[PDB]
Short mmCIF file of all heavy atoms in Angstrom, two decimals:
data_model
loop_
_atom_site.label_atom_id
_atom_site.label_comp_id
_atom_site.label_asym_id
_atom_site.label_seq_id
_atom_site.Cartn_x
_atom_site.Cartn_y
_atom_site.Cartn_z
N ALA Q 17 69.79 136.72 75.95
CA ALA Q 17 68.58 136.26 76.63
C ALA Q 17 68.77 134.87 77.21
O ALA Q 17 67.95 133.98 76.94
CB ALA Q 17 67.39 136.28 75.65
N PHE Q 18 69.83 134.67 77.97
CA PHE Q 18 70.13 133.38 78.55
C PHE Q 18 70.03 133.43 80.06
O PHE Q 18 69.96 134.50 80.67
CB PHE Q 18 71.54 132.93 78.14
CG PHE Q 18 71.57 132.12 76.87
CD1 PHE Q 18 71.04 132.64 75.70
CD2 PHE Q 18 72.14 130.87 76.83
CE1 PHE Q 18 71.06 131.90 74.53
CE2 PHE Q 18 72.17 130.13 75.68
CZ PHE Q 18 71.63 130.65 74.51
N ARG Q 19 70.04 132.25 80.67
CA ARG Q 19 70.02 132.12 82.12
C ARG Q 19 70.83 130.88 82.50
O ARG Q 19 70.92 129.93 81.70
CB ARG Q 19 68.61 132.03 82.69
CG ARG Q 19 67.90 133.35 82.81
CD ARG Q 19 68.65 134.30 83.72
NE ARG Q 19 67.77 135.23 84.40
CZ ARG Q 19 67.18 134.98 85.57
NH1 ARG Q 19 67.34 133.83 86.20
NH2 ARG Q 19 66.40 135.91 86.11
N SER Q 20 71.40 130.90 83.69
CA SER Q 20 72.23 129.80 84.16
C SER Q 20 71.40 128.69 84.81
O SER Q 20 71.98 127.68 85.22
CB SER Q 20 73.28 130.30 85.15
OG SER Q 20 72.67 130.86 86.30
N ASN Q 21 70.08 128.85 84.92
CA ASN Q 21 69.24 127.89 85.63
C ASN Q 21 68.18 127.28 84.72
O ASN Q 21 67.21 126.71 85.23
CB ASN Q 21 68.58 128.57 86.84
N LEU Q 22 68.34 127.38 83.41
CA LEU Q 22 67.32 126.93 82.47
C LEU Q 22 67.93 125.96 81.48
O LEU Q 22 69.14 125.92 81.25
CB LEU Q 22 66.67 128.10 81.73
CG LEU Q 22 66.15 129.26 82.58
CD1 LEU Q 22 65.47 130.30 81.70
CD2 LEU Q 22 65.20 128.76 83.65
N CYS Q 23 67.06 125.14 80.86
CA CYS Q 23 67.48 124.23 79.81
C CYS Q 23 67.94 125.02 78.59
O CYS Q 23 67.26 125.97 78.16
CB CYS Q 23 66.35 123.29 79.45
SG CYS Q 23 65.77 122.24 80.81
N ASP Q 24 69.08 124.62 78.03
CA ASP Q 24 69.61 125.30 76.85
C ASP Q 24 68.66 125.23 75.67
O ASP Q 24 68.72 126.10 74.79
CB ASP Q 24 70.97 124.70 76.46
CG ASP Q 24 71.78 124.29 77.67
OD1 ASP Q 24 71.21 124.15 78.76
OD2 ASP Q 24 73.02 124.13 77.53
N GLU Q 25 67.79 124.22 75.62
CA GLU Q 25 66.73 124.21 74.62
C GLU Q 25 65.82 125.42 74.76
O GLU Q 25 65.44 126.05 73.77
CB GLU Q 25 65.92 122.91 74.74
CG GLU Q 25 64.62 122.90 73.98
CD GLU Q 25 63.81 121.65 74.21
OE1 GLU Q 25 64.34 120.72 74.86
OE2 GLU Q 25 62.66 121.58 73.73
N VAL Q 26 65.45 125.76 76.00
CA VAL Q 26 64.61 126.93 76.24
C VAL Q 26 65.37 128.21 75.95
O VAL Q 26 64.84 129.14 75.34
CB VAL Q 26 64.07 126.90 77.68
CG1 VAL Q 26 63.29 128.18 77.98
CG2 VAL Q 26 63.20 125.68 77.90
N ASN Q 27 66.63 128.28 76.40
CA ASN Q 27 67.46 129.47 76.17
C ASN Q 27 67.54 129.84 74.69
O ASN Q 27 67.45 131.01 74.33
CB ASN Q 27 68.85 129.25 76.75
CG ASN Q 27 68.93 129.55 78.23
OD1 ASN Q 27 68.22 130.42 78.73
ND2 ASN Q 27 69.79 128.84 78.94
N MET Q 28 67.72 128.84 73.83
CA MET Q 28 67.79 129.12 72.40
C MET Q 28 66.48 129.71 71.88
O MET Q 28 66.49 130.61 71.04
CB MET Q 28 68.15 127.85 71.63
CG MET Q 28 69.55 127.35 71.89
SD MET Q 28 70.79 128.64 71.64
CE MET Q 28 70.53 129.00 69.91
N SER Q 29 65.35 129.19 72.37
CA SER Q 29 64.07 129.76 71.98
C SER Q 29 63.95 131.21 72.43
O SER Q 29 63.53 132.08 71.64
CB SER Q 29 62.93 128.93 72.58
OG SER Q 29 61.67 129.38 72.10
N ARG Q 30 64.31 131.49 73.68
CA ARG Q 30 64.33 132.86 74.18
C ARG Q 30 65.21 133.75 73.30
O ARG Q 30 64.83 134.87 72.95
CB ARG Q 30 64.82 132.87 75.63
CG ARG Q 30 63.82 132.28 76.60
CD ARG Q 30 64.30 132.40 78.04
NE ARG Q 30 64.17 133.74 78.58
CZ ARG Q 30 64.96 134.25 79.52
NH1 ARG Q 30 65.89 133.52 80.10
NH2 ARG Q 30 64.78 135.51 79.90
N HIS Q 31 66.41 133.26 72.96
CA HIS Q 31 67.33 134.06 72.15
C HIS Q 31 66.75 134.37 70.78
O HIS Q 31 66.84 135.51 70.31
CB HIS Q 31 68.66 133.32 72.01
CG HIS Q 31 69.73 134.12 71.35
ND1 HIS Q 31 69.76 134.35 69.99
CD2 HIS Q 31 70.80 134.76 71.85
CE1 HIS Q 31 70.81 135.09 69.69
NE2 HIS Q 31 71.46 135.35 70.81
N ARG Q 32 66.14 133.38 70.12
CA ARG Q 32 65.48 133.63 68.85
C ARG Q 32 64.34 134.63 69.01
O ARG Q 32 64.13 135.49 68.15
CB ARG Q 32 64.99 132.33 68.24
CG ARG Q 32 66.11 131.46 67.69
CD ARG Q 32 65.60 130.11 67.24
NE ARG Q 32 65.08 129.31 68.35
CZ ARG Q 32 64.11 128.41 68.24
NH1 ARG Q 32 63.55 128.15 67.07
NH2 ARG Q 32 63.69 127.77 69.33
N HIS Q 33 63.57 134.51 70.09
CA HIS Q 33 62.46 135.42 70.33
C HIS Q 33 62.95 136.85 70.53
O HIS Q 33 62.43 137.79 69.92
CB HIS Q 33 61.66 134.95 71.55
CG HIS Q 33 60.36 135.67 71.74
ND1 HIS Q 33 59.47 135.34 72.73
CD2 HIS Q 33 59.79 136.69 71.05
CE1 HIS Q 33 58.41 136.13 72.66
NE2 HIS Q 33 58.59 136.96 71.64
N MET Q 34 63.95 137.03 71.40
CA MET Q 34 64.52 138.37 71.61
C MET Q 34 65.02 138.98 70.32
O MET Q 34 64.75 140.16 70.04
CB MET Q 34 65.66 138.27 72.63
CG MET Q 34 66.29 139.62 72.94
SD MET Q 34 67.71 139.49 74.06
CE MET Q 34 68.92 138.74 72.99
N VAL Q 35 65.75 138.21 69.50
CA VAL Q 35 66.24 138.73 68.23
C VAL Q 35 65.07 139.20 67.36
O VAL Q 35 65.15 140.25 66.71
CB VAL Q 35 67.09 137.68 67.51
CG1 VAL Q 35 67.38 138.10 66.08
CG2 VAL Q 35 68.38 137.44 68.27
N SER Q 36 64.00 138.43 67.32
CA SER Q 36 62.81 138.82 66.56
C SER Q 36 62.26 140.15 67.07
O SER Q 36 61.94 141.05 66.27
CB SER Q 36 61.74 137.73 66.64
OG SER Q 36 60.68 138.00 65.75
N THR Q 37 62.13 140.30 68.39
CA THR Q 37 61.60 141.53 68.96
C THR Q 37 62.48 142.73 68.60
O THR Q 37 61.97 143.80 68.24
CB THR Q 37 61.49 141.40 70.47
OG1 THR Q 37 60.71 140.24 70.79
CG2 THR Q 37 60.81 142.63 71.07
N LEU Q 38 63.79 142.58 68.72
CA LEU Q 38 64.70 143.67 68.35
C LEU Q 38 64.56 144.04 66.88
O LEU Q 38 64.53 145.23 66.53
CB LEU Q 38 66.14 143.28 68.68
CG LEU Q 38 66.48 143.21 70.16
CD1 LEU Q 38 67.85 142.58 70.37
CD2 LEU Q 38 66.42 144.58 70.79
N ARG Q 39 64.47 143.04 66.00
CA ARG Q 39 64.31 143.32 64.58
C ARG Q 39 62.93 143.89 64.26
O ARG Q 39 62.78 144.60 63.27
CB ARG Q 39 64.56 142.05 63.76
CG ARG Q 39 66.02 141.66 63.68
CD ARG Q 39 66.22 140.37 62.92
NE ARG Q 39 67.63 140.04 62.76
CZ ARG Q 39 68.11 138.81 62.66
NH1 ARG Q 39 67.31 137.76 62.67
NH2 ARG Q 39 69.41 138.62 62.54
N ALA Q 40 61.93 143.58 65.08
CA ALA Q 40 60.57 144.02 64.80
C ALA Q 40 60.40 145.54 64.95
O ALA Q 40 59.48 146.10 64.35
CB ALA Q 40 59.58 143.30 65.71
N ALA Q 41 61.25 146.20 65.73
CA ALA Q 41 61.12 147.62 66.01
C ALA Q 41 62.47 148.32 65.87
O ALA Q 41 63.03 148.80 66.86
CB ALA Q 41 60.53 147.86 67.40
N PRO Q 42 63.02 148.37 64.66
CA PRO Q 42 64.35 148.99 64.49
C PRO Q 42 64.38 150.47 64.80
O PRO Q 42 65.46 151.00 65.12
CB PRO Q 42 64.67 148.71 63.01
CG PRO Q 42 63.34 148.62 62.36
CD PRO Q 42 62.44 147.95 63.37
N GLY Q 43 63.24 151.16 64.69
CA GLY Q 43 63.19 152.54 65.14
C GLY Q 43 63.41 152.71 66.62
O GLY Q 43 63.97 153.73 67.06
N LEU Q 44 62.98 151.74 67.42
CA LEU Q 44 63.08 151.83 68.87
C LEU Q 44 64.39 151.27 69.41
O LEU Q 44 64.98 151.86 70.32
CB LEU Q 44 61.91 151.11 69.53
CG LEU Q 44 60.57 151.85 69.55
CD1 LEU Q 44 59.57 151.11 70.45
CD2 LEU Q 44 60.76 153.27 70.03
N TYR Q 45 64.85 150.15 68.86
CA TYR Q 45 66.00 149.45 69.41
C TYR Q 45 67.29 149.63 68.61
O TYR Q 45 68.36 149.31 69.13
CB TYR Q 45 65.68 147.96 69.53
CG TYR Q 45 64.50 147.66 70.42
CD1 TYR Q 45 63.40 146.96 69.94
CD2 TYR Q 45 64.49 148.08 71.73
CE1 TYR Q 45 62.33 146.70 70.76
CE2 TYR Q 45 63.42 147.81 72.56
CZ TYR Q 45 62.32 147.12 72.07
OH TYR Q 45 61.26 146.86 72.88
N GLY Q 46 67.21 150.13 67.39
CA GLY Q 46 68.37 150.15 66.53
C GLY Q 46 68.50 148.90 65.68
O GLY Q 46 67.60 148.05 65.62
N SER Q 47 69.64 148.79 65.01
CA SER Q 47 69.88 147.73 64.05
C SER Q 47 70.70 146.61 64.69
O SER Q 47 71.79 146.86 65.22
CB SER Q 47 70.62 148.28 62.82
OG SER Q 47 69.90 149.35 62.25
N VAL Q 48 70.16 145.40 64.65
CA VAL Q 48 70.91 144.21 65.03
C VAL Q 48 72.00 143.96 63.99
O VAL Q 48 71.71 143.71 62.81
CB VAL Q 48 70.00 142.98 65.15
CG1 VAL Q 48 70.81 141.74 65.43
CG2 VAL Q 48 68.97 143.23 66.26
N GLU Q 49 73.26 144.02 64.42
CA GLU Q 49 74.38 143.83 63.50
C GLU Q 49 74.96 142.42 63.53
O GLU Q 49 75.40 141.94 62.48
CB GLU Q 49 75.51 144.82 63.81
CG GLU Q 49 75.24 146.23 63.34
CD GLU Q 49 76.52 147.03 63.19
OE1 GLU Q 49 77.58 146.54 63.63
OE2 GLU Q 49 76.46 148.14 62.63
N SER Q 50 74.97 141.75 64.68
CA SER Q 50 75.48 140.39 64.73
C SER Q 50 74.69 139.60 65.77
O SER Q 50 74.32 140.13 66.82
CB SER Q 50 76.97 140.35 65.06
OG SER Q 50 77.73 141.00 64.05
N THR Q 51 74.44 138.33 65.46
CA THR Q 51 73.79 137.42 66.39
C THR Q 51 74.67 136.22 66.74
O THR Q 51 74.20 135.33 67.47
CB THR Q 51 72.45 136.93 65.82
OG1 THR Q 51 72.67 136.37 64.51
CG2 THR Q 51 71.47 138.07 65.71
N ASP Q 52 75.89 136.15 66.24
CA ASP Q 52 76.76 135.00 66.42
C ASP Q 52 77.94 135.31 67.34
O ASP Q 52 79.07 134.87 67.10
CB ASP Q 52 77.27 134.50 65.06
CG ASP Q 52 76.16 133.96 64.19
OD1 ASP Q 52 75.25 133.29 64.72
OD2 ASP Q 52 76.20 134.20 62.96
N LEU Q 53 77.69 136.07 68.40
CA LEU Q 53 78.68 136.28 69.45
C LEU Q 53 78.39 135.34 70.62
O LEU Q 53 77.24 135.09 70.95
CB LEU Q 53 78.70 137.73 69.93
CG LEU Q 53 78.73 138.85 68.88
CD1 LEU Q 53 77.33 139.24 68.45
CD2 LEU Q 53 79.47 140.06 69.45
N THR Q 54 79.46 134.84 71.23
CA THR Q 54 79.36 134.10 72.48
C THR Q 54 79.86 134.96 73.62
O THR Q 54 80.82 135.73 73.47
CB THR Q 54 80.17 132.79 72.40
OG1 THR Q 54 79.70 132.02 71.29
CG2 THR Q 54 80.02 131.97 73.66
N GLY Q 55 79.23 134.83 74.79
CA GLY Q 55 79.73 135.42 76.00
C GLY Q 55 80.48 134.42 76.87
O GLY Q 55 80.78 133.30 76.47
N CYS Q 56 80.76 134.83 78.10
CA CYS Q 56 81.43 133.99 79.08
C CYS Q 56 81.35 134.68 80.44
O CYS Q 56 80.93 135.83 80.55
CB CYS Q 56 82.88 133.71 78.70
SG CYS Q 56 83.15 132.06 78.01
N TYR Q 57 81.75 133.94 81.47
CA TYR Q 57 81.77 134.44 82.83
C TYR Q 57 82.53 133.46 83.70
O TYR Q 57 82.75 132.31 83.33
CB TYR Q 57 80.35 134.65 83.39
N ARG Q 58 82.94 133.94 84.87
CA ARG Q 58 83.70 133.12 85.81
C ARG Q 58 83.66 133.72 87.21
O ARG Q 58 83.16 134.83 87.40
CB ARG Q 58 85.15 132.97 85.34
#
């Protein structure tokens, strides 16, 4: 739940919020197995 045009302070809040939503409905979204992965791009 990140963006390249936003403050990283906001991005972290979004990421925590998304994780909460996924955990809130495990019947619909499945099981969150890891939250400590980093991505990349170029």
Side-chain angles (χ1 to χ4, degrees), residues 17-20 22-56:
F18 270 56
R19 280 301 209 87
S20 63
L22 310 183
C23 299
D24 324 19
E25 167 184 353
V26 175
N27 276 328
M28 293 307 299
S29 186
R30 289 183 77 208
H31 188 284
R32 287 173 296 150
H33 190 177
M34 181 184 72
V35 170
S36 189
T37 306
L38 290 170
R39 286 177 177 151
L44 281 190
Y45 300 123
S47 305
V48 176
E49 284 201 350
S50 298
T51 54
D52 295 321
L53 312 88
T54 303
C56 257

